[model samples]
Each structure stands twice: as structure tokens, then as C-alpha cells.
Target: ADIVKVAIEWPGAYPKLMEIDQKKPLSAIIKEVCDGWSLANHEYFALQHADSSNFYITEKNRNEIKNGTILRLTTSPAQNAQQLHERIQSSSMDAKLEALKDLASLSRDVTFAQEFINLDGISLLTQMVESGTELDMLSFTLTAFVELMDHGIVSWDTFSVAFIKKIASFVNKSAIDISILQRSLAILESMVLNSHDLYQKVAQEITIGQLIPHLQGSDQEIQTYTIAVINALFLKAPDERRQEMANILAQKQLRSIILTHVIRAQRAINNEMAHQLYVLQVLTFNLLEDRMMTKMDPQDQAQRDIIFELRRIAFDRDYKKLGFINHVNPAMDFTQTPPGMLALDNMLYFAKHHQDAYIRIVLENSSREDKHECPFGRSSIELTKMLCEILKVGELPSETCNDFHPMFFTHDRSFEEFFCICIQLLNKTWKEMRATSEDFNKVMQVVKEQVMRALTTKPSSLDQFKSKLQNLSYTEILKIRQSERMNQEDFQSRPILELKEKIQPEILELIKQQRLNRLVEGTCFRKLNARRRQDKFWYCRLSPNHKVLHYGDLEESPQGEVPHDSLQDKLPVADIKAVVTGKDCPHNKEVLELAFSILYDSNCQLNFIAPDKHEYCIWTDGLNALLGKDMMSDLTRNDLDTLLSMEIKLRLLDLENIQIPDAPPPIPKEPSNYDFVYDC
Candidate 1:
């Protein structure tokens, strides 16, 4: 006689087993296995062996049952409904625990989970927790409830009061197993991660003080899990409660535990600690306030060490030896771009909450070639703003101010050099940053306000600013002028009037012969007589000294046209109101022949056609110069300096090809007869 075992597997029920006679027919065994059970109503389930390779039907026996074989009775809906009903109605604790263990294990399967919920297994599990005596029984019951809730089959409100109170009551017991604590806290952490409302409801019932005692426990797993729960609470804390929560964590010496863990991680070169460090840094920055930081005295070495350690790990790095797969690959591109590993929050922490500490830390590391001289970079906008605040408050070292000016061009140095640094940031932000235009405008406004503050307090800073102004390029000056002009609406409008004048052609010849000097001669067309009547296209000579313009015909003509022997009429430059380009020729349709037109205050119009726009510009410049708007005359001392600097740079660019001319000798000065010449 071969001994074989048969088991029944169903959702929300413990699998049942019994010894069976393998020599019996499969149909007889099936009827006997499900005898007196609701599963007998369903003919769809089959009897499967442990390997599931053998299936016997109720109609016939397919194979012989080997000795010591385990046969499983798998079920469908009717069988599941019958078995689940039996398990729910069962009174034995062992049977119920086994059923829960089976259900909890099956909670991940959607079908099983739905069946578990549909059969009131959720309510059954909560009752199990209420009456559970053994730790495993209570643990598994709680875990199954949480699992159902996590899968969204169970509603939080459905079990909030009973479930939270029961679990809290279980954990509050003086003596509890580590497994219970782990499972309970794991459930709490899941709630924290998934549902904030659930976490809050649970948190209001259990305080951080309750969690702190577990941190004292020797179990590393429990400790990490506890800390993680606390970290999540801190993260989800409301703004009004954030400061209080951070303060409480710091007061409990949470930093020491985190710092120790960090040191251990660094010793082992663990990558898992990155997230831990991120949370630790967040807590540290939040806890940093003027009141908290002011407690850090120079005499308190322990306190100082704690703060220093935070800075060290957050910022410190080593030039790790280059690793290799095959050959030497020691070299990489050396760029001025610094690494992003600098803890921006820590930098901001020092700058805003502790200025002296920030300056000390910054100055200590400011000399590093790879570091930013100021916190003004592309990383954090708020960090840059805070750094500007620190500088404005005069907390930065004088050396940092001096350091900024070497990159900037200024001779008379003051703390206003710092203002220039902010301006430098503005310019870079405008040109390089892809940020919205409004952000750039905001930055400009901030820079301007800071500069104005410096100017108002220390009046001599204005002198230094003036020195910097002398070095600003035309574009930079224009930006400043435009910003200033936009702040004012004090502009006056100029009126235009018209007067007509008739001139004789011979009169221009007389005026030219008497006053004009031919500084430049170029090919041009001059309108004479009426608007469409023009005869001579002349190669003319003209100058600023000339009171009136006159032109003679070209000696050689390209178009083979006859040249007029007499002179064309001239106009006075003083009568010109404006110079404009012609949209089209008034006399002809040719493009190049219709270049420039001069508008006069006397309603006397003069149109001259240049070969191109370039020549048109030249004539405009010359006429404008004679009209008393010379470009050189309009330039200031600073403008001359900028031009000179540009010229030097241009010259140095071709130094190898440059030739030096001999210096001209100075002329001897004649002795003045008057004593006033000596005094003057």
C-alpha cells in the first residue's frame, strides 16, 4: 500500500490535507477528498500532484499514484466561495492564523486579494489583531491588513479607528519582538510614503517621542527604518511645523547619528549613503538659524567640530586616482567649469543664517582655482541672492572685493567693486542664460537696487563707480543709459519748420572758390534745377570747410554721356534738418542711382546718389560733421578710452605683421612777449 497525501488550496482559507489511499480510483479519491464540503458542488476543479505534471479527473484515473506523493486540490470560484465561507466561520485560532498567513501571502495576487476582500477577510484580520496573543499572529494579521489597504482594495477610513488603535496598542507593549516592531514600522513607513492623510492620522496618534526610544535599540534595521519614518514625517511637515520639527530632530542629537553613519559609509565608499546624506543635509540646513548657529562658539570644540563635519562631507572631495580598464587614461579636459557637488543649500545656509561663518568658510576656500570667487553662479538663484545680501551687509572679506576687480576693469577700488561683480552676473545672465526675459529683468532690477544702495550710503563709492564707468564698453554704457532713461519720462519734443530758397549756380562756384577745400573727391549725382531735371553726374570734391557745395563734371565718363562744362548748384550744410535714404529715385527708377536724400529746414531738398549704402553712409557722416554733429565731438573721455583700448587689442592681434614708425620730433615753442602767457 502506497501512502499519499491530498491537500485543498483555496483563497482566504488554509490549505487542508489528509492521508489517502493511492490504490483507490481517482474518481473515488476526488469524491472522498471533497466530501461534506461545498467544493463538492463544483466539478471544474482538478486534483494536481505537487509538480503539477499529473492531473486526474473525476471521470477516470490516468496514472498510478507513487508513494509519498503530495496531491493538491486546486479550485475555481464555487470552491473558493465554499472554502472561504468555512474559514471565516471557523473558531480555532491555529486554523484562523493559518488561513490569514495563506491570505496575506496571496494578497499580492489581484484575484486572491479581491476574493479576500469580498469574503470579509479584511474585517476578519482586524478582529485577529484585536484577539491575537502570539507576536507572529498579531504581526501577520497587521501586515495583511496593511497589504490590502496598500493594494487599494481596503479603504483607510474603513479601518482607521480600530486598526490604528490596535496596532498602536500592540507596539506600546513593554516587551515586543523585533519582528513585530519591524513589520509594524514597515507598515507605518509605507503609509508615510503612499498616503499623507493616513500618515497624518497615524502620526497624530503616535508622537516622535515614541519613535525615539527605538533609535536607542541595538538593532540596525529597526533604527534605519525608524529614522526613515521620521525623515518622511519631516519632509511632509507643513510649513508652520517644519521649523519646529527640524528643531526637535536637532535637539535630539539626530545629527550625531547621521554623521556617524556618513563616516562609516565614506570609510566603506558606499553609494547607498547618497540619499541618506541628502536627507541629512536637508535637515541640517533647515535647522540652521541665527539662534541655533550663534550657540556655536569658538571655545566649544565639540560644537565646532559638528558644524565643520557637516561642511566637510557636504563639500569636500578628493582627486581620486584615475581608474583604468586597459591603459593609461590619466588626462581629461581642464575647464574652468566647477563641479556641481558643492552643497548649495549649505552655502545658502551660511550666507543667510550665519554671515560670519559663511564668509569664513568662503574665504578659507576662495583661493582654490576651481572655486567660485563669489556665490554668483548658474546653480541656484536663491543662493546668488543670499550671497548678494551678505556682500551688501559688508560681511564679505575685503580680499574678496579686491579679488573681483582683477577680472573687472577699474582703477580706483572701493567696495563698489562688488557692485561691478553683480553687474557682471547681469550681463552674463542677459546673453547666455536661456531663462525667461522677466527673470533677466528681475536680476537687472536687483543689481540696480544694490548699486543704488552703495551709492547712497558711501558717496565716495560714486567716484569709484565713475572709474569703472570709464572702462565700460559702448554696449555696457548703452545698457546703463537705457535703464536710466526708462525710469524717466522727461523728454522734450523738437519742432520742424520749412522755408524755400533759390540759389544761382555761379553763386555756389564763387562760394566754393572762396571758402571750400577739397578734402574728398568721389563719384556722385547732384540734383539741379527742378526735382526731375538733373544734367551733370560729377566726380566731385567736398570738405567741412566748404560753406557751400558745388561739383564739376567727370573728365572721363563710363556711360559715354556728354559732361556739362559749367558747375552744378550747391547747398549750405547749415540748412539741413536731417539726412535720409531714398526709398526710390525721384528722377529715375535705377536702384543705385537713388541712394541718399537730404532734407533741409528751408524745404530745399538735395538728392545725391552714392554707388552703394557704404558710400551713402560716408556722405552722411561728412554732411553731419559739417552740420556740427561730428562723431568725435560727441564722444566723451570714457568713450575715447574704450576706443583706445580696442585699438590696442586690434594692433596686438597682428603684432608679428605690425611695423613701427619713427617718432616725430616736437616743434620748438616761441617765447611769448606777454606776462599773461606765463601766468596762463
Candidate 2:
């Protein structure tokens, strides 16, 4: 009688009462319901052991329970689970489905369910999938999988190709809710990100097609999730495929759709999303460089089409960070150009018309059949030169009259990042050329001569505009002349190589000479580099132009040394010299007088003998007589003064026809305690 009543109460008739039966039931009834759901209840279902009641579901009414879980969506499916029994009945499929659904729902509750969901629920799902569990219970397993993936605790179990193909087919055309699909994939992405085990399963499956569709998806979460997923996955692919993959990402036609939700963000919330979009843009751009650009076969037009399509989309995108694509510079190759210019063109337009700072970008596809890698080498250099050109010489306004400031070109990180990227590329190319090409040295020498000719050819300092053009990239110049098919002759006229050779050496010589002068002169020419113990490193010539003259190599006149021989004749010459000290000068009065004092003051007193016949000089002999003892120990000031005074005036002066003063004043007597009082 109780069983019959339970059955009658669990109908559509009583909305609230039916929900109660969905929560809890006795073992006998749960077992009976499990059987009705076409499930072998004992195979997958377990007895609720929480209260040691051993209540187990039977195989009879599983479908009925699943049906109830499906229909009741408004609130907790387990709202009434514990009313009659602490554990769900093993026999009741209705109760089983309800509890499962309720547990899954509670697991996602931001506050209460994080721990249990990740530790307990996610682990079970991962293990079951790994162990090849049956698919009949997908609804239950699928729910847990979603939860696990979303919580960063899920990964794909290693499966055979057949298994992956089978699972992938499930997501293709199913009647799944859009939110559910998005959330499920997001969870999968997180799992792939966190777990190496899971990433391996889907890593190769994450193809250009799969990634692009998500980028184009209407849902914001899908786009963001896929953007990150693709970034990771594409990075893992071989370098050759990176461009194709990036082109898919570069999808220019979908610019509106990709940017629609991102750009519309309110000022505060917009930054994070905007930055993410920028990251996507940069990643796409990176694929065209040597580091990330993937190779493709020339026969593959589809790949080419995809790359071009990306160019269109990236260039058209309204909000772009690096703008290289918009302007049509006849000087640069189409494939080498970037989406940044498109953005700049828009910015220029907006700034010109509406007076806003917004810009648009268009990435042009420059990858040609002739070149093996992306044309990033030439493209970036040309772009840099072009930008320098614009910045150095103000662009003309067709209708307006305001000149843009230099800060406009270098306002943010994008410009700096672009410059660094170009420099890196140039460095690599130069290194490679040095390794293989012998003529490279000679050719560069000639190029240097030409540069000198150009520099000296001009009478005064040329505009930065003219200076920058001399720094053009060889490959870029080739493209400008459509010399892609040309032999060595086309590359022979490479101005960039020439300028580097001539300019680099001359600048280095200047810096080296300056540093040497500082050391020898002992004057502060420039701050010395303590690390190298020199004024500057030889490589310091490579520092930016603005710092060239910061340290000086001054030149001076006849008395003083100048820094260089070249400056010996320059105007305003400085004078410098080395001082001659006592050791250097002969006949120093201080030394001669000290010798005389020692001889005369000592008791070993000497008398000047034959001084007049000698070389007009004073001398002492038999100095012992003057001291009252032959061996004298010390010099007395009075004795030395009396003797030396007489030697200088009476002896040497009289011998040289010296005229003493007609009347001499009395000399002061020497002090008794004084050490010396020589009168030489």
C-alpha cells in the first residue's frame, strides 16, 4: 500500500509533492525506478551509506527519476532529499537523479561548494573518464566534467584516437544549450591549461578551424576562452603553421564582431577586456615574425586565403594597438606590412576630422611564394623608417593647420615595442650575413664610402628625415623596386648595410680616441667607466644618437695636449703641459744650498781653497779644522752662515769681477737654536 501511494504522489499532478519524491525514497522504490530508466542500476548506482541505513536503488525506476530531474529546473532538485531518509534510496532512480543534480548544482555555488566540488567530485569524474566508463550515464558524468573543468581540476584521460573522435562528435550537432556548451568548453580549456595530461588529449585537436569559429562566436566568454586556448595551442604547433594559424586569428572581416563586445565595455570594465583583445592582436602579429610564423606549402591556397583574410580583418579592426597596416607605402612589401598602419590611418583620420585619438589597423599579408619565412625582417624596418619619416618631418594637413607633436608617434608602449622588435630582427640578419658572406664586408665598405659622400656632400646637418632614409633595410628596398627576382645586383645597392659599415666604424674610432685622451691627460673628459676602467666601451658607439656628444674629446693648443691630431688645428685651442719638479731640474737652489750648509756647519770644517782658480764655484776642505775636532758630528747654523756668506760674496763674486755694494748693511746674526742659516 505504501509503494502504491508513493507512485501516485510522484506524478505531474502535484508540483510540490512530486518534487519531494524526487529528493528521497525508500530502497525498494528507488530500485524499482532505476530499472525503468533503461539502466542497470546496480552497475553504476550505489547504496547511500551516510546513515548506515544501507538504502540501495533497484533497477526498476531509473528513467522515471531521470525524467523528474529533467523537468524540475527552477530550484534545488534535492530540496526534499533528507525528509524521510538521511541517504538516497538505492532502489529509487528518481531520488538518485535528484540528488546527483542537486549536488552538481551546489558544487558551482560560489561560496559553499568549491572544495567538495574540486576535491571529491572532479576527481571522480577524471578517474571515471580515464578508466573508460560507459557512456549511458553521460548526463551525470557530463555535469561533473563541466564542474571539474570549470574549477581548474579537470583533464582528459588518455584515450585512443577512436575515443577522441567519438567524444568530439558529441559536441558537434547536439541540442545542448549555448551556455552549457560554452561553459563545458571553458572547463575543458582550464583543464588543458592546468593539466599536462589533458592538454595532450586535445592539443592537436585544437586546429585553426576550431579556434577561428570560437573567435567568431557571439558569446564573449567563448571568444575570450578560445583566444587563450588558441594562443597556447598555436604556440605549440610547428613554426611553419603559425602564420596560417595566426591568419585565422587575424580574421579582418570579423573585426566588427570580435571587437563589438570588447570595445563597447564601459570605461572601468573595458580595460581588462581591451587588453585581452590587444594581446590577441599582438599574438596574431607575432606569427608573421621569424620566432612564431609557421611555414606553409606554396600549393596551399587555402592557407594563403586564410592569411589574407586575417590581414583584411586585422587592418579593418577599429581599435588596434600597433598600427602598421593602413597606409599604403609603395616602399614596403604587401605581405610584410602589419595591421598597425590601418589603425594609424584611422587615428590620423579621426584626429584630423573628429579630433579623437582612436585608430584602426589593417594587417596586410606579405608572405610570398618566393620567401621561406614571413617578411617581418624587411617590413618592420620599413615601418620604422616610415614612422621616423613622418615624425621627423611633419605630415601635411590637406585642410587643417596643426602640426602633430613627436610625442604623438611615441605616446605609448606600442611604439617602443615595435622599435625593439625591428632592432632584434636587424641584429639577427646582420649576424647571419657576417657568418657567410665574404663580399658582405667589401660591399659594406663601399656602402660606407657612399654614406660619407652623402654626409660630406651636404654642407650642413640634414633633417632627421634625410638621415633616416639612409638607414633603410636592404630587403625592404628590394621590395620597393619589385626586385624580388633580382640577382645579387639588386641587393648590391643595399644602403642600410653600407651606412652601418661606414657610420659604425667612424663613430667607434671617435669614442675610442676620446677615452684614451681622458686617461693620459688626467683631466675629466667624461665620467670614467669603472667597470671597463675606461671612459667608454668600444660598443658604446651603438648608443642612441642623442647621447653621441655627451662625453667629449676636447682638443687644445701648443702648451696643452688636445684629444686628437685631427683637432690640432681647430679654433679655440686649449693649452696643457706636464710640470717639471725638483728631480727634473738641475742646479736647483734648494739642493745646492743644502749641500753647502752641510759642509760649512759641520766641525769637519773645510776652507775654500783655490776657489778663484776653479770653476767660479765655492768648495770646502779640511772641514775638521773649523770645528775644533777632526771628526764633526753635527752642523751649526752660525758657522755655516759665516762661511757660505763669505764664499758667495767675497770669494765667488770677487773672482767673477763681481762688485759688492759700496756700503753693505749689517747682516742679522743667526739664531742659536736654528738648524741652518746658509747665506749662499
Candidate 3:
């Protein structure tokens, strides 16, 4: 009967099965047997029997399938049946027993029977499961599941959970025969993700114990699925219970692996997604504190630091801070910390509850990350207020005796140099890491690791922060350092390496310029302009609204259109406020003398949009006396740095499509585009 079946339909089924089947000689019988299969089943059967010639469902049968008639199909031996038999044979002895158990479980007429699969059909499936050689039986099992998925009629409970476990076990135990995990992932993703309500139930079955083992699998697809599964699990977990779940997840050793995956692969998915995972990691487990001390043993430190950095990055809310931290700590920290350590406490507080959206908006408007460095967003006045707050810790002397000359001395560094130095020095690490043994290099490397803790944050208005630190002094840091007990190493050699490597060269130069840009003579500003008195407002006029003078300037300002013909009349002038420079003064003469002059006033006044107490908008109390005064928008382009660099905008366009509204459609200007896009 089979031979007769094959003989009738071999011709049609042979071509439909794309690949050739060398093992099966009964092509015609197999094709004839499948002569009237329903259209959908026929293609599936064809796909299954791709290696066999006898699995053909001709165009005629396919047309009939469109008519919705009886389209029964059968195969004497499914195509690739030999391969499938091999798969089953290779399965663990226990796996085979498990499969058998799964079949019996299906026959219980329990929840699985609710799937509308009849006892008779289940019996046939079980019989077939035994009939096929090892590989064939495994294929049959998978096909049954695929058929169920195709039917889309069964719910999670309708499928024997044991069967799913068995499959996962196969994958977990290294018994899975399939070459790609994507097929399984795609199907599972569809099932769980498409059915959100079933997510919790599915998650309950796939515990960290069962799921985490697959993370070690060689397959990237499996790793991604496992991550997604964990994420889905977290999504379903209640907020109150999330911390507990985190603890369990952390205990499972899932964090380091997931973090590594996220760092290496998750950014391509979404930074926020990766960040959330990191936050979850941190939430679940204690982050390392005093990890800096571990740098003495770098290899161990590297591993832990890398893991910590990955976690920190994942949790870091501020991407700009992330970039800054990256330069400080390119590697991870591994030293263990006590629970509720200050750093972790600060981090958890921020990750769990900090509201950065307002800050982010200001950053976005500024088109830079520097703008949002100080969370407080204080202005020069507010900075003074903050200084006053610190002063409240003790009383300030009313008069300055010789012994009481200003208690604090300030030195300014160039942020530009610092930022650039971070980039340039770390460029080698970014390009490719080689080996280094210099102790300073190692120290810098450690600093790089520390910097990375902040680097993992998404970029914000950090570019605006370029000048934020200029006014902040080393002395100020010392005062803050007083609050926290500092170790001897932290005070002396800790920053030595980072200062050289990560602090930008340009910023260093700027710092140099800041220190030397002092007044040797009296009243340079007064000589330039007598119209306005050089007071606090003049200080604001001369420097930025929140300017921090660090070092000397280069003293190479342009002398108008002519080299020395024009003067400093049109410029802000060469005033060194509150400075008395004389011979042997420790300032740069050339840098101090630099001045600028413009030939004509273009009627465009040099008005700057100063940062309010908050850097984003000018800080104001609500409802001034004026009833209907039109308030200015927070958006401003008057700042020098603000207009200099390009802005990086996010969420403005669908990244998938890279479409930005109001942005001019990008013109194809490069040869590479034409060549790549329209090449023959």
C-alpha cells in the first residue's frame, strides 16, 4: 500500500521538497500518501520532509487546500527521518524516558486534553513516538509541539509543562540536536511575549535554576532568550517583591553573566533596557564598595571590576556621568562592600527613586551632557548659597588677620583638557587593549575603572559641564573630603595617575592658562571701558555666568582685523579681577596680556544666556508681581559652549527608522553612500 502511495505522487512531492533525500528510495509512495493533506499541513509536512522526494503536495492539492476540503497527508518515512532518528538516539537515556513520560502525561485527559487533542490522536502520537528510530521520535515530538503552536488553540496550561521542561532540559543538558536556538527562541518569544498573561505562568516553570544553566550555552540566541526570559520575569514580579526576586537572581550567579551579555550585546538592544537589568542586578545584590583597594591585585580586580562596572553601567541613570566615570574607571571593581555602603546607598537611592527627567530635558535642550553634572543645578548665586551652607558648619572670621588670610586657596583646571585627556589617553583602550605594566599606568587603569562606573550612564547635557568644574577648587574638594574620612592613599597618590592620563591635555593647558592669566598692572578693564563700572555684574560680564577660573589663558586673543592696529575696546578686556601681579609673580605674563578687538559693531549685542540657580533655566519663584509678563522659554543658544559643539538628540526619532522630525532629510553627499546604496 505504501509503495502504491509513493508511486502515485512522487513526481509532485519531490520538487516541493527543496533538498534531496538520499536515504529514502520510496519517494512516490510517500508523495502519494500525502496527496490530500490540508494546505497548511502539507507545507509543514513538505518542510519536514525536505530531504525526501516523496513528501510532495502538488500545486493541484495546494489549490484544493484553498477550497477547504479534506486534505489528509501521510508519509511512510518523513524526509530527514534518518537525521531525526539520529537526534533521538543521541538524546540521553533519561531524555528518552522523559519523552515517554511526557507522552503518558499528555494522555491523562487532564489540562492537556482541554487542548482538544483527542485521546486517540495522543495515542497515535505516542505510538509514532515509539515507532520512529531515536532521531525520528524526537522530531515527531517537536513537530507535535509545532503543530500545537500552529493551531494557536492551546494555552500554557494545555501543554504539558513537563514536556516544555524536558525540552529545556535537553537544551540545558547539552542534548539539544538543533543547530540554532533562534527557532526555539522565536517560537517561545511569540508564545510568551504575544501572550502577556501567560508570561507569569511560563516564568514560574522556568526558574533561575533551570534557566541560568542555558546562559553558559555556546549559542548567542539562547543567551538572548534567557535574558529576555529573566527580563520578562522581572517585569511580571510585583514591585514590593522585586527586591526579593533580585536577591534570588543574584544568588543564582545570573548577574555577572547577564551583565556581561548586556555590556557586550545589550546596548544594541537598548541602553535603557540594559540599564534596567543593571539596576535590577544592583537591587538584587550588594554592589562592591572600597573596591578601589583591590586594584593592588589587578587581575582579580579586573574581573570583579568589570562585573561591577557592567552592573553599575546598567544601573547608572545619567549617561553623561557614565562617560565621565568611564575615563576614571574603565574597568570594574570587585572588592566586596558592606550592605548599604554609602556608594551603594547613593546609587540605590538614585536608581530606585531619583527623578532625572527634568534634568534630562534641560540637558536635551542644551544638547550636551556637561549641563547636567551637578544634580542641584545651582547658579553662581546658588553656588554661593551652597558655600554659605557649608560655612554654616562653622562661623567665618569677621576680619582676616595675617594668620587668618583666606583659609582656602583655589586652583582651577581646564575641563576641556580633562575631557579631551580622558578621550585621548583612553583611545588606546578603546581601540584595542594590549598589555601594560607601568605602575602609574596601572593606577591610571584603576582610575579608568573608577571613571567607567560613571561612564555607563547614558549621555546627557554633559558637554555643558565643561565649565562647571572650573570654578570648583581643590580646596573645596578638601573641605568636602573632611566630611568623609579619607584614607592616606586617596589623599596623595590616588588621583596622580588619573590626573595625567584621564584629565584632558587641552583641559590641562586651559588650567595652565587660567593660573597664569593674572593682572600684572592695574585696571586693564577700567582703561578699556569707562562707561560701565567693573563690579560683580562686571565679573559676570567678563566671565561666564558660572565661570570658574582655574589656570592662565593662552594670552593669544585676536587683535581685531589687524594684528596690533585694533585694541581691547570691543572685547571683554584683559582684566584680572582681585589680582595683584608684580615682578616674580607666579602668573603667565603673555597669557595675561591677551586681548581682542572688533572693527565694527554688527548691532548684535554679546548677550549671553546665563545659567540660573538651575543650569537649565533661570531659577525663579512662581508668580512675580507682574500679572501677565511673558516668560522666556528655557531654550537658549546664547552661551559660547552651547553654540560650539554639535548636539546629540535621542528619542527624537525612532531609532529603528532613524527618522527625525524637523531635521532636514539627510542628503546623500558621500561616494560611499552612492556606492553602497546603488552599486551594481
lDDT on C-alpha atoms for all candidate structures? 0.46, 0.34, 0.32
lDDT of 1 at 252: 69
Best by lDDT: 1
RMSD per prediction, one decimal?
Answer: 34.8, 34.8, 30.8
Q: Write the per-residue lDDT of candidate 3 for residues 482-599, one digit (tens) a residue.
A: 5333432332243222333343344333322332232111011111211111110112112321132221111111121112211122233222121111221222122122222111
User: Which stretches of model 3 miss by more than 4 angstroms?
Assistant: 1-136, 151-156, 162-175, 178-204, 250-255, 259-680
Report the number of the highest-TM-score candidate: 1
TM-score order, best first, reads 1, 2, 3
TM-score result, candidate 3: 0.28
Which sections of candidate 1 miss by over 4 Å? 1-72, 77-85, 133-135, 193-196, 218-220, 261-680
Model 3 root-mean-square deviation: 30.8
Candidate 1, pairs of clashing residues = 499-602
Tens digit per residue, CA lDDT, model 2, 360-464: 212222322322222332334344434343222212111111111121122222344334333333333443333223343333332333233333343122233
